[PDB]
């Protein structure tokens, strides 16, 4: 109940939310149908439109007008935004040359530069270039301020998950808004675009920027606008709030535009009808910047122009129907469209089995335009699994396609020509970032970055301490002129042991054998040095990774590679090696095919054993340093040490062997040498974070050898590829992956073919940031370089996408 008998007189766009059943006058009262009776009359004035004309100049103040051209309007904070231009011979902000803002130039009373977040729905990255002729204001912000060629949204590339990631710095799996549509099994409640449940606080996790500001005594404009409030009114309200007295004035504001998403859906991302929405948005920016100028705030405010996701060409004909795949179609519930999420329709149906549904959706048709996944096998870069609102079965839909349950759904619900929601690496889903103002850099282009990084920066622009989030604070310091956040490296928690030769061969009873008893002061003196670390400078280029949890581990040196060997998990946590452009591949000699050698530096009780592998019919083993890249026949024996061994399904060994035999050398040739760090990952609970020993769900049968859920590699070289990886004087270049350790290759529909046709594609799907590997392993990489730590953070956030230009 709302007793809407009170009045909005004096209270138009009030900043505090008044408690029901008192009537509201806030920018969201319409959405709750709770505004007072006179809200339209007093607060949504439209008379005369939005622009001064010559004949209004110096007029008598008529309180009925949407905005004012009277002499008193400036002090009343309520002129039309073009007032000084029409009536005072001033120029529009867009017509002024840009001039570096070297220091903030703010009115007295301003304790910090305000931040204005200008968010545009469905603003595809390529519009910056492709629409630049019709967006003069946006193009001025872009070229005078700091810009990225594009910003990576989060998955799914939908509106609510992305705006709430911008507000919080969190992955959807963590903030809880994992779709535009959700069922929460614990609440037994549904979140829908239409309705009132979406307003309940229990959906909204983390701590949004506006709550962060309020709690730390920074005042915030209310971020949300009811759809019906026109953009011109939204802008004038922000401008009016900026004229409030110092003690009442917010320091952060949000504007939101439903365009160009709205027209993109109807016309496609590049339909000729899209020119208009782009003009209209640019006009709105112009109004804001003209209004800031009148307020003398145009060299004081930091403006962020940011999109939530792009827009792709999608039509009704490109729909796949689950009914062409499943018999039991009416026993499932499908969340459809540009992603699929499947659950049982009834929890009382004991004949529901996710494995049979998955198999009926797997590689069933030649040109199949979606791939089924259990959520925990989704690429780790998506971070889309650790929430009860995310259905166990997920469908990654190909760009340009839809999935639906049955055809009736599609023609009983072509209308739309654009949509979004696809894999956040897809180029058509990328969006925009421009920063403009005193705290941002002047005419600077920065590399593409992910929108999870922005919360930290917005907190930095406001002097706030960010809540715990998934940003890497310092990774975007290069966007900022000042207010940088100067992070320190985390402290190493565990120091390694450096074991020497401590065990005789006969102390080992591992059921392993090697044809190695085939036997000097030239060569013996030299293998001693190699096991002490003589060549560590070549294979460990950026220091050893720090271990950021309590554990027992050993550093193991070798001619060709160095490793940090875990006595707890019985395998390395990481293995580091350098492959120069000139390195040669060799095969594993015949006599050494089955060789595994005990490591006399490491006790039997902390070693793997070959018998567990013999007796486990499902499980085989691989090596972290590949025997194929040994520097010499003598060096190859090190590659067969039991301490270089890791458990691998034979189907996975197909992927791994190809990567080590073919791809490592190919990348070395291409990048002028590469440093490679490889290792296992254990994430049985799919939270994106290292599992402890007591969370391991799977061992090699009979033994305490834990099975990784994933294997990673980090591959580093010189950004200036004229320098070799091992002698690089400047910035580094990196690519990484986190490959699922799976007992079949069902993910790769072409996997019966040669590895040269499918392996690298699979690797690409599972591209990763070094930072993702850090969360998954508890290690900190790149500890000793010549580079600044901020530059290193940026490197750790880099995702190599393999999308074209
Ligand atoms: C991205 O960044 C984010 C933010 O930093 C990272 O997420 C954090 O990870 C932490 C470690 O996993 C996690 O800490 C846990 O907090 C538990 C209580 O937390 C409450 O309070 C916080 C702070 O205000 C709040 O944010 C939480 O809100 C969650 O839950 C509600 C819904 O229920 C949502 O509104 C909200 O969105 C959020 O949900 C998300 O997180 C939870 C996990 O907490 C998931 O369940 C959801 O799926 C969703 O993703 C909470 O209200 C705390 O109880 C935990 O402590 C247990 O474990 C420790 C181990 O040290 C143990 O010692 C403790 O005793 C305790 O164990 C006891 O409980 C167990 C389980 O019931 C039981 O088995 C034991 O026997 C014990 O009795 C834990 O410390 C932190 O909450 C989140 N923060 C957020 C916002 O999600 C995230 O990791 C980053 N991602 C990546 C890839 O890096
Ligand atoms: O008020 C805010 C807001 C919310 C959070 C915000 C966070 C920040 Br930070 C800044 C502005 C914000 C504005 N919003 C009003 C609109 C939009 C954002 C939400 C999504 N939505 C839809 O109807 C919708 C839109 C495009 C779609 N495409 N496909 N399906 C779609 C469904 C309802 C809400
Ligand atoms: Ca985990
Ligand atoms: Cl959705
Ligand atoms: Na076996
Ligand atoms: Na296959
Ligand atoms: Zn949309």
From Swiss-Prot:
The keyword Transcription does not apply. PROSITE patterns: SMB_1, SMB_2. 1-hexadecanoyl-sn-glycero-3-phosphate binds at residues 159, 180, 261, 420. Abundantly expressed in cerebrum and cerebellum. Localized in secretory epithelial cells in the brain and the eye including choroid plexus epithelial cells, ciliary epithelial cells, iris pigment epithelial cells, and retinal pigment cells. One of its GO terms (molecular function) is calcium ion binding. The active site is at residue 159. GO terms for cellular component: extracellular space; membrane. The keyword Lipid metabolism applies. CDD domains: Enpp (cd16018), NUC (cd00091). Residues 541-805 are annotated as: Nuclease-like domain. A motif (Cell attachment site) lies at residues 76-78. Binds 2 Zn(2+) ions per subunit. Binds 1 Ca(2+) ion per subunit. GO terms for biological process: cell chemotaxis; cellular response to cadmium ion; cellular response to estradiol stimulus; estrous cycle; immune response; negative regulation of cell-matrix adhesion; phosphatidylcholine catabolic process; phospholipid catabolic process. Its EC number is 3.1.4.39, 3.1.4.4. 1-tetradecanoyl-sn-glycerol 3-phosphate binds at residues 159, 180, 261, 420. It comes from the Eukaryota. Zn(2+) 1 binds at residues 121, 159, 308-309. N-glycosylation, but not furin-cleavage, plays a critical role on secretion and on lysoPLD activity. The interdomain disulfide bond between Cys-363 and Cys-749 is essential for catalytic activity. Its cofactor is Zn(2+); Ca(2+). Glycans are attached at residues 3, 348, 360, 470, 750. Keywords: Calcium, Chemotaxis, Cleavage on pair of basic residues, Disulfide bond, Glycoprotein, Hydrolase, Lipid degradation, Lipid metabolism, Metal-binding, Obesity, Repeat, Secreted, Signal, Zinc. It is an enzyme of class 3 (hydrolase). Pfam families: Endonuclease_NS, Phosphodiest, Somatomedin_B. Residues 773-794 are annotated as: Required for secretion. Secreted lysophospholipase D that hydrolyzes lysophospholipids to produce the signaling molecule lysophosphatidic acid (LPA) in extracellular fluids. Its major substrate is lysophosphatidylcholine. Can also act on sphingosylphosphorylcholine producing sphingosine-1-phosphate, a modulator of cell motility. Can hydrolyze, in vitro, bis-pNPP, to some extent pNP-TMP, and barely ATP. Involved in several motility-related processes such as angiogenesis and neurite outgrowth. Acts as an angiogenic factor by stimulating migration of smooth muscle cells and microtubule formation. This is Autotaxin. It comes from Rattus norvegicus (Rat). The gene is Enpp2.
